[PDB]
Each structure stands twice: as structure tokens, then as C-alpha cells.
Design a protein around this ligand. Structure first.
Ligand SMILES: OCC1CCN(c2ncccn2)CC1
Length: 165
């Protein structure tokens, strides 16, 4: 199971970890991807998770988009976790760098409530441009299921822990 996490609340845990390495070690039931509406896993967490699957995530995703069309910002879909997890929950947080509504971050986190336990990154953080402190706050105030957050950046991890109210 999950090890080395700092407990923030009854159901939220956090660790300074590379989510790909964490997923390869834990093999969780669900790993969350920081997806975009097109499931184009180019960079950030998505690029890294897809590279770990040897592009199998992208091949599966392109078939999903060809059949269903794009996701909504704030929405999600469950696809295979490939070699990383049983399932991957592709969740689209708002991308501030694309001018998307930050209010959609709560809707994005609500997708996590459909899964009893998840390994996840902070939604809309990193290259999505939102304030990770705000993302952690929305996570704690929205997710009720057990969420194990992996924060890649040590300096950001320390700032998130030290400023957590
Ligand atoms: O390219 C190497 C990386 C794999 C780890 N990443 C991550 N993990 C957890 C939370 C946020 N980012 C960033 C990319």
C-alpha cells in the first residue's frame, strides 16, 4: 500500500514523489492523470504517465476521443491504467494558461469521489497554471474519498505542507 505520506486530513495524504514512480511501486487501483479535453498527453504529468506506458495510454486515448469526442473541462473518463495502475482516471482541471475558469477546479475534484482510493497529482497545478496551494485547498474541501497526492517538486511540497491550514 501507500507509504511515506503525510496525513493532512481524515482522507487526504501528501508525499513528495514522482507520480510515475509512485504508480509503478504501488500499482494503485486508480491513478489520476492531469488530462486535457483532447487526451493529448504531451507534457506535465500526462506526458510523463503516457511515456511510462510506452505511448499505450495515448493510443487508447485517441481511440476514446475518436469514439466519444472531447471531455469537458471539469470532467473525466476512466481508461486503463496500463502498467501503472488498474485504471487511469483522466481528469481535466481548468488550464489557467488557456484562460479557463478556475471555478471548474472544484468540479474536476468531484470526479475523485467516484473512487474509494486514488493516487493523484494536484489538479490544475504545474503547466496548467493554477496556484497549487489553492488546488490543495479545493482538494481537501471537495474530495471525500481517500486521496494520496504526489507532488513532484520538493520545494513546492514543503511550501504546501508548511502553509496547510
Ligand atoms: O517528467 C517527470 C515527471 C513525473 C512526476 N511529475 C509529477 N508527479 C507528481 C505530481 C506532479 N508532477 C512531474 C513530471
Amino acid at each position: 500500500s501507500f507509504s511515506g505520506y503525510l496525513k493532512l486530513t481524515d482522507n487526504v495524504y501528501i508525499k513528495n514523489a514522482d507520480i510515475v514512480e509512485e504508480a509503478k511501486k504501488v500499482k494503485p487501483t486508480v491513478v489520476v492523470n492531469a488530462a486535457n479535453v483532447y487526451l493529448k498527453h504531451g507534457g506535465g504529468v500526462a506526458g510523463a504517465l503516457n511515456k511510462a506506458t510506452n505511448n499505450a495510454m495515448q493510443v487508447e486515448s485517441d481511440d476514446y476521443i475518436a469514439t466519444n469526442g472531447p471531455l469537458k473541462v471539469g470532467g473525466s473518463c476512466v481508461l486503463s491504467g496500463h502498467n501503472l495502475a488498474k485504471h487511469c482516471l483522466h481528469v481535466v482541471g481548468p488550464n489557467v494558461n488557456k484562460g479557463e475558469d478556475i471555478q471548474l477546479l472544484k468540479s474536476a475534484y468531484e470526479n475523485f469521489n467516484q473512487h474509494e482510493v486514488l493516487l493523484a497529482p494536484l489538479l490544475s497545478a504545474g503547466i496548467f497554471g493554477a496556484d497549487p496551494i489553492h488546488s490543495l485547498r479545493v482538494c481537501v474541501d471537495t474530495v471525500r474519498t481517500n486521496v494520496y497526492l504526489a507532488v513532484f517538486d520538493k520545494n513546492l511540497y514543503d511550501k504546501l505542507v508548511s502553509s496547510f491550514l
